[PDB]
């Protein structure tokens with residue numbers, strides 16, 4: 286029983302790959318479904334050209350400060366070199382602006398729209414199909 | 415020291431890093447979650463050599479080789495020594511050891527040339543025949 | 545390589561990354577990483593050179609920057625020319641000397657660095673006109689098929705002349721132009737709205753969505769005839785085929801279909817089983833469990849399998865060809 | 869220099885735990901120099917710039933017992949030659965017979 290395509294149970298019995306966490310005790314010892322095997326993956330360490338987030342998440346260096354929350358926990362946009370007042374009144378973002386407590390803003394598009402790939406300040410339409 | 419001097423193994427239970435490898439014991443040895451070390455041979459052989467039973471977590475048993483005449487393998491994929499096979503003890507908890515299939519008496523050899531046959535399933539040298 | 549620097553100490557030849565004062569270099573001179581990564585507590589280098597015993601204890605979140613007092617501050621603050629960290633590690637002359645700005649950043653004559661995208665966005669992020677200077681900002685001709693407006697934004701050409709203020713400054717709504725003959729609508733594939741200068745695909749005219757923001761497109765459709773046979777009706781006055789009444793899908797939208805699922809009562813020509821399944825009466829005794837609960841054949845007498853058949857202890861009949 | 873750290877060299881920071889254990893950790897030796905002097909007695913002497921106490925007989929013995937030299941730098945009397953000896957400008961005592969012998 287090759288380990289990636291097939292699985293072996295503590296009872297020295299073999300089970301197919303998908304069965305390993307299907308939620309059924311395919312092998313009666315209940316080794317299949319063990320939390321040791323089923324627990325969530327170990328996220329890859331952030332590589333060069335990337336950035337680190339409090340969230341255990343890695344973000345491409347370009348995304349690190351573009352007025353969009355890419356780290357999920359806002360760890361990317363927080364703390365950029367402010368310069369002039371980044372007030373929402375500039376109307377830089379096309380559809381939505383949110384002012385941060387420490388100045389600066391983060392932007393979101395309305396449902397059905399996602400920030401554009403080449404200009405995250407603009408919005409493009411999701412091809413839901 | 416790597417030897418359980420407390421029955422509960424509480425002595426080794428808090429041993430610091432013993433080797434810079436982060437491991438507690440050297441090569442040609444086996445290590446247990448209680449920070450107690452045992453000869454690798456004792457792994458999965460029907461005896462909790464490690465008091466916490468970590469030396470034979472059943473998942474470990476599949477790897478150890480067991481030649482059929484000197485050692486025996488049980489239906490639980492656990493190995494037992496040759497003499498244990500019919501000693502009258504369930505050395506392996508599946509009770510494969512002591513099975514009548516294995517323990518039943520031998521098959522007597524067929525009578526060869528220069529011999530004679532007996533109703534008893536017995537063979538006698540031709541000279542002894544009368 | 546040309547991404548490295550070449551030096552020889554006595555006779556041996558050594559190759560070293562040309563990284564700046566804001567970065568740290570690891571064992572074997574294999575790779576260079578931002579200085580904040582050095583003691584963050586995560587082994588970043590290809591070897592243990594990242595957090596050897598020389599790194600002091602770690603006091604804050606991953607990826608942040610630490611100061612010689614014992615306090616942490618975010619990393620982009622490192623050389624912004626203002627002491628965000630009172631320890632003065634921030635703006636440390638050793639680190640800012642020979643300063644260089646990372647690829648996610650752009651640098652201006654003010655000896656200041658701003659995120660690369662912030663350039664030409666109407667805000668003087670460099671604290672001076674350098675990042676907004678119209679000389680370098682001009683001539684930013686966006687891609688073909690796009691449209692450019694007075695807000696300094698580029699937008700899909702199709703989005704022009706719709707009441708959606710997409711440019712933010714209403715520049716994409718030249719009302720006088722939008723109502724010109726060129727913008728006029730193709731009656732064979734489009735539809736027009738009663739109170740707006742907008743055109744929508746004809747299929748959209750009725751779909752349950754206000755394709756015209758004035759709700760004028762859908763106003764016409766109302767038909768929902770509740771046919772009496774082969775159909776079922778729902779509390780919210782919606783009708784669906786009878787088969788849909790009990791299928792695990794809430795088709796009515798109010799669960800009125802699925803909540804009343806009671807096994808159909810069998811007719812006088814049928815028989816009932818443990819799952820209340822209904823089977824023709826002929827099936828009750830034929831030596832096959834037409835109902836998987838064996839409702840049939842369990843009550844019947846122990847009759848025998850007529851010729852050309854084989855029998856099983858379960859009270860089943862099988863053709864002889866199948867026997868072996 | 870650092871947090872939770874000690875500084876004893878130009879541009880260098882060293883762990884505080886290393887200080888005061890006899891180990892010459894600082895290449896410039898300051899790890900032991902500032903350890904507070906620790907009381908001692910019963911015939912022993914303690915010297916500045918170290919947290920070390922040494923037998924009193926050693927203090928003036930011509931050996932540098934403390935790295936700063938306080939044991940020999942402190943005031944203690946000199947010595948002179950016996951009637952059986954001769955002295956010369958080297959600060960030396962030599963047998964009197966050698967006074968005039970072509971050697």
Ligand SMILES: *[C@@H]1O[C@H](CO)[C@@H](O)[C@H](O)[C@H]1NC(C)=O
Nearest residue numbers: 369370371372386387388389
């Ligand atoms: C900049 O923003 C601050 C609030 O963070 C506000 O108090 C200040 O008046 C603003 N200055 C200008 C010139 O907009």
Ligand SMILES: *[C@@H]1O[C@H](CO)[C@@H](O)[C@H](O)[C@H]1NC(C)=O
Nearest residue numbers: 379380381382393394395396
């Ligand atoms: C902005 O976003 C909020 C939700 O975050 C939403 O309620 C609001 O309608 C949006 N406005 C625009 C103009 O997109």
Ligand SMILES: *[C@@H]1O[C@H](CO)[C@@H](O)[C@H](O)[C@H]1NC(C)=O
Nearest residue numbers: 433434435437439440441442
């Ligand atoms: C690390 O483990 C090896 C066996 O794999 C052992 O021989 C060695 O002593 C350990 N590390 C050292 C050098 O102490």
Ligand SMILES: *[C@@H]1O[C@H](CO)[C@@H](O)[C@H](O)[C@H]1NC(C)=O
Nearest residue numbers: 613614615616629630631632
């Ligand atoms: C570091 O932070 C502490 C509080 O966490 C504060 O007392 C101390 O003054 C700070 N250091 C400096 C140099 O301000």
Ligand SMILES: *[C@@H]1O[C@H](CO)[C@@H](O)[C@H](O)[C@H]1NC(C)=O
Nearest residue numbers: 728729730731732734735736
């Ligand atoms: C399209 O329909 C409108 C309304 O019937 C009409 O006024 C217009 O002339 C038509 N245009 C064409 C090109 O058929």
Ligand SMILES: *[C@@H]1O[C@H](CO)[C@H](O)[C@H](O)[C@H]1NC(C)=O
Nearest residue numbers: 324325326327328329330341
């Ligand atoms: C990520 O994976 C490694 C092995 O590659 C370890 O399982 C580690 O525990 C994981 N990381 C975390 C944070 O648990």
Ligand SMILES: *[C@@H]1O[C@H](CO)[C@H](O)[C@H](O)[C@H]1NC(C)=O
Nearest residue numbers: 430431432433434435436437
């Ligand atoms: C214990 O193990 C860890 C991980 O390997 C470290 O090596 C640590 O240095 C060890 N502790 C001691 C005091 O040796």
Ligand SMILES: *[C@@H]1O[C@H](CO)[C@H](O)[C@H](O)[C@H]1NC(C)=O
Nearest residue numbers: 518519520521522523524535
């Ligand atoms: C003797 O041995 C053979 C196999 O070598 C069979 O097991 C056979 O069943 C035995 N003989 C009898 C009489 O049972």
Ligand SMILES: *[C@@H]1O[C@H](CO)[C@H](O)[C@H](O)[C@H]1NC(C)=O
Nearest residue numbers: 831846847848849850851861
């Ligand atoms: C077995 O049953 C069939 C009907 O299914 C016939 O009655 C047949 O005569 C029976 N055979 C015997 C031997 O009783």
Ligand SMILES: *[C@@H]1O[C@H](CO)[C@H](O)[C@H](O)[C@H]1NC(C)=O
Nearest residue numbers: 947948949950951952953961
């Ligand atoms: C010097 O010391 C010696 C002992 O070696 C004698 O006491 C001698 O008398 C001393 N001489 C002087 C001048 O003090």
Ligand SMILES: [Ca+2]
Nearest residue numbers: 304307309311
């Ligand atoms: Ca399973």
Ligand SMILES: [Ca+2]
Nearest residue numbers: 348351353355
């Ligand atoms: Ca971002």
Ligand SMILES: [Ca+2]
Nearest residue numbers: 456459461463
């Ligand atoms: Ca064992």
Ligand SMILES: [Ca+2]
Nearest residue numbers: 498501503505
């Ligand atoms: Ca036995």
Ligand SMILES: [Ca+2]
Nearest residue numbers: 581582584586
């Ligand atoms: Ca690190």
Ligand SMILES: [Ca+2]
Nearest residue numbers: 621624626628
């Ligand atoms: Ca700063």
